[PDB]
């Protein structure tokens, strides 16, 4: 009977935990935890939530191979 | 072997005043090249070794040539001594015995007689990749001959000191390509393969909350690594091939060893039990999966088991694992029409250890070996004997890993 607007994010559980860490560091990110592979996230952050993801997967991967 | 005469042609070119490094596989006959050079020079030859088994092998090569008992071929060790004679000599010494500092067991004078009387003329250093260290610089600083030779199999290290050997002993003269040698002699085809196993959520968040070497205790103890490990073990046992499991960590080797119910060899282990496990691996067909640590790999390499599994690993020591892997690969030679050697690297996604194992695979690319990635071989879903496949066993294993973190 209620309807709220958000951003449905579908990803693997590891990326879900990473997004929960983004919400744990910056706040005002994740609105709800739907299941193991979905999340309700503030739309105005999605691009950021994406870009930061790249950053946190750029700090994790390393691999300069030089 | 043709490449051995290709190396001896350089000695046949100039003759006098020469020094360099010759790269030959462990399965090749570099000791035969040392014997031939000793026959060409005919002088007091000293062979620097780090283990007594290599001394016994060099003595066996001396027996393959001629003479060892008469007062000419000497033996230097911490147990006994043997006299020598000029104009011709063959002796093997230990790095730790010649180095030392002030500890003495009334034997450093016996070495300072071989170094004081000036009975030399040919230098042979086994495994030159270990030379980058102060003790070896002291050994070179306490010796001086007319011709020097460096027998080694590898030289990949990240200490940025391998280039110094170009002036400490001499620049590398001949580097044999292991692929062309594989065409000359089937030294087991190298199939490099990384197994990408999924990572659970709890071990992922706990893995991120951990750091340093403690997070390795959360990277190895992943349930999917146990499931894929059992799948590879049962698969190789179904193919009728023996399995060798490597692990840089002793605790993980004991965990997988006790959970798989197979013999294990690690540090502080009695030598009689090690020899018993070796004989059971050589003769008993019921033991086709052994768990070997660095002690079981550096001391002895067996020509059996075409299945090599890698689980535990340490940061930076990827080149050493590539050298040991190369030793197990070169140790398997018998000229077979098939002869497919399989190296598996059990790695989990989003972990800090796979990104160094990729550097190890880069070392495996520099050698010309073939590398391919493997996400998952279909067949593990049909194995009901897999452990830690149920959420109950995954939670219990999680509690065990948490207790292990509380102990460390």
Q: How many secondary structure helices (H) and strands (E) does chain A include?
A: 2, 3
Please say whether the dihedral angle defined by the alpha carbons of residues B287, B291, B294 and B295, taken in this order, is positive or negative: negative
* Count, residues in chain A: 66
Spatial distance between the Cα atoms of B110 and B108, rounded to a whole number of angstroms? 5
Structural biology method used: cryo-EM
B289, containing H or E segment = strand B289-292
CB pairs under 8 A between A and B: 23
C-beta separation of B288 from B324 below 8 A? no
The residue ranges of every structural domain in chain A are 1-66
Distance from CA of A3 to the nearest CA of B (A): 30
**Strand order through the sheet with B307-310:** B264-265, B289-292, B243-246, B307-310, B340-348, B189-197, B370-374
C-beta separation of B90 from B72 below 8 A? yes
**CB-hemisphere CA count at 13 Å for B231?**
21
Tell me which residue in B201, B350, B358 faces A60 most closely, judged by beta carbons.
B350
Spatial distance between the Cα atoms of B233 and B262, rounded to a whole number of angstroms? 11
Which token pair is B344? 């598996």
Q: Are strands B172-175 and B289-292 parallel, antiparallel or unpaired?
A: unpaired
Spatial distance between the Cα atoms of B147 and B274, rounded to a whole number of angstroms? 40
C-beta separation of B242 from B282 below 8 A? no
C-beta separation of B217 from B369 below 8 A? no
Q: Measured between beta carbons, which residues in chain B are less than 8 angstroms from residue A16? A: 201
Residue with structure tokens 């070497």?
B213
Q: Are B199 and A14 inside 8 Å of each other by CB?
A: yes
Distance from CA of B194 to the nearest CA of A (A): 16
Spatial distance between the Cα atoms of A22 and A20, rounded to a whole number of angstroms? 5
**Does residue B47 sit in helix, strand or coil?**
strand
Q: How many CB atoms are located within 10 Å of the residue B287 CB?
A: 15
C-beta separation of B73 from B90 below 8 A? yes
Resolution of the entry in angstroms: 5.8
Rounded (5°) CA angle B334-B336-B340 = 105
The answer for residues whose C-beta is within 8 angstroms of residue B193's C-beta and 6 or more apart is B342, B343, B344, B345, B371, B372, B373, B374
Buried b (16+ CB within 10 A) or exposed e, B155-173: bbeeeeebeebeebbbebb
Q: Are A63 and B350 inside 8 Å of each other by CB?
A: no
Q: How many CB atoms are located within 10 Å of the residue B15 CB?
A: 10
Distances in whole angstroms, Cα of residue B350 to Cα of each of B56, B225, B282: 47, 14, 39
CB under 8 Å, gap of 24 or more: what pairs does A37-42 form? A37/A10, A37/A11, A37/A12, A37/A13, A38/A8, A38/A9, A38/A10, A39/A8, A39/A9, A39/A11, A40/A6, A40/A7, A40/A8, A40/A9, A41/A6, A41/A7, A41/A8, A41/A9, A42/A6, A42/A7
Distance from CA of A22 to the nearest CA of B (A): 13
**Does residue B194 sit in helix, strand or coil?**
strand
Question: What string of H, E and C letters represents the secondary structure of B198-210?
Answer: CCCHHHHHHHHHC
């Amino acid at each position: 009977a209620r309807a709220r607007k958000g951003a449905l994010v579908q990803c693997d559980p590891s990326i879900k935990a990473l997004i929960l860490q983004i919400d744990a560091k910056m706040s005002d990110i994740v609105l709800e935890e739907l299941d193991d592979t979905h999340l309700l996230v503030n739309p105005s952050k999605v691009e950021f939530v994406k870009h930061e993801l790249n950053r946190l997967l750029s700090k994790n991967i390393y691999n300069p191979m030089d | 072997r043709p490449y051995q005469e290709k190396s001896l042609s350089k000695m046949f070119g100039n003759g006098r005043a020469r020094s360099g490094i010759i790269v030959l596989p462990c399965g090749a006959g570099k000791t035969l090249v040392g014997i031939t050079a000793a026959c060409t020079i005919k002088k007091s030859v000293i062979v620097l070794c780090t283990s007594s088994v290599s001394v016994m092998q060099w003595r066996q090569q001396f027996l393959x040539x001629x003479x060892x008992x008469x007062x000419x071929x000497x033996x230097x060790x911490x147990x006994x001594x043997x006299x020598x004679x000029x104009x011709x000599x063959l002796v093997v010494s230990t790095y730790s015995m010649v180095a030392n500092x002030x500890x003495x067991x009334x034997x450093x004078x016996x070495x300072x007689x071989x170094x004081x009387x000036x009975x030399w003329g040919f230098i042979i250093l086994d495994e030159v990749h270990v030379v980058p260290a102060a003790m070896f610089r002291r050994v070179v600083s306490t010796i001086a001959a007319h011709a020097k030779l460096g027998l080694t199999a590898t030289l990949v290290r990240e200490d940025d000191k391998i280039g110094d050997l170009n002036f400490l002993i001499g620049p590398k003269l001949y580097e044999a390509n292991w692929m062309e040698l594989s065409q000359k002699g089937h030294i087991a085809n190298v199939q490099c393969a990384e197994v990408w196993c999924p990572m659970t959520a709890e071990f992922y968040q706990e893995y991120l909350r951990e750091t340093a070497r403690k997070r390795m205790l959360l990277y190895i103890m992943n349930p999917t690594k146990f499931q894929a490990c059992q799948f590879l073990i049962q698969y190789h046992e179904r193919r009728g091939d023996k399995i060798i499991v490597f692990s840089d960590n002793v605790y993980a080797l004991q965990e997988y060893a006790l959970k798989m119910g197979k013999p294990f060899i690690y540090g502080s282990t009695p030598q009689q039990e090690r020899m018993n496990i070796l004989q059971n691996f050589q003769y008993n067909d019921q033991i086709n999966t052994i768990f070997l640590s660095k002690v079981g790999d550096t001391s002895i390499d067996l020509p059996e088991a075409t299945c090599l599994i890698q689980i535990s690993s340490h940061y930076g020591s990827r080149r050493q694992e590539a050298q040991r892997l190369g030793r197990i690969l070169r140790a398997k030679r018998r000229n077979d029409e098939g002869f497919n050697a399989f190296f598996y690297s059990l790695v989990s996604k989003d972990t800090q250890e796979m990104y160094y194992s990729t550097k190890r695979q880069a070392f495996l690319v520099d050698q010309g070996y073939a590398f391919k990635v493997i996400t998952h071989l279909h067949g593990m879903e049909n194995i009901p004997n897999l452990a830690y496949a149920s959420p109950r066993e995954r939670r219990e294993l999680l509690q065990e890993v948490l207790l292990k973190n509380e102990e460390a």
